[PDB]
């Protein structure tokens, strides 16, 4: 009876395929976790684009002036 | 190649230690040739090239103007340096370290330029061969430096790049270390045959 | 030479007869603090933490007007000695380690520029790029030459290459500096562990019956 | 014959594993749908960052002035 | 009429007695280069590559002051002939092909406007929208009428519709121009291939035994 | 409907070829009625409507002002056109082409307005029925154009939209072409029964 | 006291001898409409819908110059009565409900400030934070005290905590106000339904044979 | 603690109803002590503290200045209030409601300050215990309010937070309600045994 | 013996289910690849928002002036 021999190969191939689905499913969760961080870091930038900062007192820089060649 | 004449002027302040010592030099350059200069350690205009005496004596003759430039050591260098303490000298950016294959340890985006980088071979400072690319000024108030070292690969051997910077209270260290699939393949297949054999032995013992 | 902890140049004034054109910059430890756009009479700060201060743009224009008068008095005494054009040195490198996909800024450093007249442009497979290109001002040196930096905000692609085109009077022809940035093994490795872990689970299921068979 | 007993456990464990893959696959589609909305809301902001608005006529605010103490 | 390769209008000045209000724009090949906000005395450039130039806003104010004096001298000679109000033509279309989700800009083109007095507003299910709405200046024509464009940066939704409300003296009532933007078959198709590919793999597994059975 | 009086002024430059020929017309409009105009090909103010002679002769009387306006052909049209070469005439934006079901070929976001669009039926220019929506000016220095054509669907038949634009060195062509699931269903099920039958035949031959 | 529907303060002028420093703000229903930066002579609007108006910054400088002269005449008549320093009240709360990951703005409200001299800073695990920090102007009260608000645009993290450091003359030492923001059960729950739904499908497959067995 | 002297001035307009009634008070404060004030309902400068008569009579003596300040009721309060109608009084922001575990109903980011919040227990207004945090002014023209209520949990019981605001044409209501896994576990396992038993019964009946 | 008949249907349904998981897993990778490009194009915009451009020399536009009606 080789019918049970046939079923044996199918189950092993079926479980081998399930390993591939698990590996790629775990692989994609790395992208989503990385994409989530980038998306929310970009949201933070937007939030700061609409908020100014209270200015500090104005102090002028100083310079030097050259002279004239007679 | 059209003819071109370039005149440039530089007012340079030098700050040794804190405000303890300050030098002030103003440089008059005509096509990469500085001819007249002021030195705070001389307080008198001097001539560098033969194109100087016509301007050195005349500028030094006017006492009102000569006193004005000599006072710029305090009204320009020391005035601006106070503002430098709050903003520019206070700027500090933490470096970033990455290691890629020699083995290059890239330290990028840091300020100021003071930094020390070390390479380790299992808690041993590998000083045999280390080639350092000089400080690179990106232009955006940032800096770079590249350190590379030759390797003799070993099983289980690790390499760590050690850095330190004035902006960091604690030094930053980054380490570097199909094989996993092959290793699991032998263990699982052997375990697969390990359990299969026991079925016959249990069958034979029962029978 | 002078050795000091920090060096500041609060009077970097430039002027030349080619344009005529000039430049005003302030430098501290080799970095540009700001520049004054002479035509627009505006002070553009190069560091965000430095925007809290004030510098009058008209101050810069007064200084460069003096350099213009000084230069005319010097051309006569020098008997019209034109500037000796130099050979620029061009170096292209990436600001950050090149990872495909992440934003990065290319850096083209033109060194030993004299006179301060140069055209720095970026080429992508032979076509000019005019998006995301920025340049710094002519930054001073100790030999009274200059260096300039051009930035190219790019998204790295393995199929795309870039060049830095530097045109200067001291070059016979325009100078170009170039810059260029496992599946089968991974597939075999993934399949190898797949069948191994498949057989590992199969053995335990068969072993569980075998152990339970005796009892 | 305990061989068929062994195959029985393997299939049940195999289908139990497939339930886990389905649950996590459905779980990730929630993140992608949420990430898609955030990505396209950020794209909308960019679009508006480059478009000004036609100004309205200028009307000045009014103030009060204090007095001097003799 | 005049036929030419390129047409530029560097003197488009407008003034009317209703406000009183005016407008200053420069046009090149039918597109607006900039406009001078008369109240704020500022020059707003409409093209990024054109911000490198300079135009004094006070120049525009001098010209419109002349038009005001000219108009008063013309009202007397014309014996107060008021403007004949026209019927605007309103067209609404999408800037890019409408794909649900991708950002897009709605375009409402009001044509044949005279006098230059119009209220263009956007409606979303009966409620006014004041977010992401921008308008262009009154752009000139050859019959001395005007056309204006209003933009609505929107995110297309299959459940949301928009209208362009155009109010003008030449319309009896306000004008509204409207704009509006497989699972079972896909499920059946997906299942059909699923069972087919399922049986295909089953056959080979059974075939492998059958071929090996003879040996 | 309140009464309103509108006065508008236009200074229009016309550039035929390069700077070879230039026309300069200034138009004085009173409520959509141009009454006084200047023509560079006449260099003399003229009157269009009966409201003109009062202003045509007076403006032409002042020789100082009349010479000023006649010189604007060079100081306004030719001065500005030099700046137009660097920025506006240099602007070029690559078009984008999409095809959706007739069959509309949308060409969007391009500048300038010169463009040629063709429809192909398997390397045959389908000129039987083509309806073109005129050029649409978005207002943001962009343009649109829509081309649609009727179709007689065929198995394996493809349609390509061919465009060309001054901004493009090479023309851009975009093509357009459950059925896959149904086709695979018949092949796999037949193959499923194909292998199953051989088992009995091998069993019968062995037996 | 006065009871009204809306209260507007169009003349809030401040001046003190410590700096010397001053402030100009307009308030409507307790919110700041704009402020005039005295040093930079610029009007900064605090509400986007209010940028369409115009207020001359020089108007504010004239008013505060009067307050300076008024104050010197009052110090003599008051025989130099210095301000009695008060004890500020500091409250820290989140602008939106705290969900880990979503952007949020921290709010530190310092109340009962007098004189208007205070240092509000943010601490993250003992280190100062200078990114995303913004503050409002000294907003007036009815007892002639002030309150100020500092914002900290933060990304919440379960491992990160924040404090609001408020320094004032009325506090003996600097005041700090603190702010701080299932797997096993889920795994057991997921497995419980997994084996249940696994057995449910197994039963029907076995039931289908059993029902078909009789026929 | 360095000595500091603070002088502040306030020009306050009060708008009762529409422009029907307006009060105008200007307050002169010296270190939290208002000494001189103007009242539009008096139109005459008054003194609050003993530091007032020196300034109250002198300011009131100058008739030109006194008339100027009295006219500010129209040129300042009524001038600005017209602009307030178009921009500030027209501003309206829709509130957001979230419910989290007592049970707090957070209403955030709304303007103006008029709001009414109710708690419901299955279409019954739960007024037994409700503690409301007062209005919180975020500073950015926004407002907050927190409402919490004690709960007695019940199977199938729901709680809804009811809000209303001038910016909303229709009130906003938000509701709140391993157990699912456990419930399905019992049903499926019982169904798993339910089908298994029928196989033996069908086998026994056939046999 | 109908027990083996029952197991036959379960395996075919099990492999049919695995096809659905593979199809949806491949489907989601299209979204992630598309979302990755949009996320990194948005990151590029941010990068350019903080970098100005060296200005070109200022050249003034020219205008025409109308005349007065006596
Ligand atoms: C080109 C040339 O001959 N230039 C001459 C130079 O050689 C000479 O030294 C000078 C006299 O001082 O006059 C000039
Ligand atoms: C409304 C009306 O009658 N207006 C008259 C017009 O008809 C007449 O032609 C003009 C004389 O030139 O005087 C005015
Ligand atoms: C510190 C001190 O003694 N100050 C005095 C005050 O007590 C007295 O009332 C005033 C006379 O009016 O002269 C001053």
Author numbering:
A (entry chain F), D (entry chain I), I (entry chain C): 47 to 116
B (entry chain E), F (entry chain B), H (entry chain H): 3 to 103, 114 to 189, 196 to 225
C (entry chain D), E (entry chain A), G (entry chain G): 2 to 182, 188 to 221
Lines from the paper:
pmcThe major histocompatibility complex class II (MHC-II) molecules play a crucial role against pathogens and foreign antigens in adaptive immune responses by presenting peptide antigens to CD4+ T lymphocytes. The assembly and trafficking of MHC-II molecules are regulated processes involving invariant chain (Ii), which acts as a chaperone associated with MHC-II subunits during MHC-II biosynthesis and antigen processing. Previous studies have shown that Ii forms a homotrimer (Ii3), associating with MHC-II heterodimers to create a trimer of trimeric complex, Ii3:(αβ)3 (6, 7). CLIP lodges within the peptide-binding groove of MHC-II, acting as a “placeholder” to prevent premature peptide loading.
We determined the structures of HLA-DR/Ii and HLA-DQ/Ii trimers to a final resolution of 3.0 and 3.1 Å, respectively. Despite having similar resolution, the density map of HLA-DQ exhibits superior clarity. Within this map, the TM domain of both HLA-DQ alpha and beta chains is distinctly discernible. In the HLA-DQ/Ii map, although density is observable, a poly-A helix was constructed within the TM density for both HLA-DQα and HLA-DQβ. The overall HLAαβ/Ii structures are approximately 140 Å in height and 80 Å in the longest dimension of width. These assembled complexes adopt a C3 symmetric trimeric configuration. Specifically, in our study, Lys102 and Lys106 on CLIP exhibit the potential for forming polar interactions with Glu55 in HLA-DRα, as well as interactions with Gln53 and Asp57 on HLA-DQ. Glu132 on the adjacent HLA-DQα (chain D) engage in a hydrogen bond with Arg94 on Ii (chain C). The full-length HLA-DQ/Ii trimer complex, with an estimated molecular weight of 480 kD, transformed into a stable band of around 350 kD upon Cathepsin S treatment rather than Cathepsin L2 treatment. Based on molecular weight considerations, this suggests that Cathepsin S likely targets the region of Ii between CLIP and the trimerization domain, leaving the oligomerization of the HLA-DQ/Ii trimer complex largely unaffected.
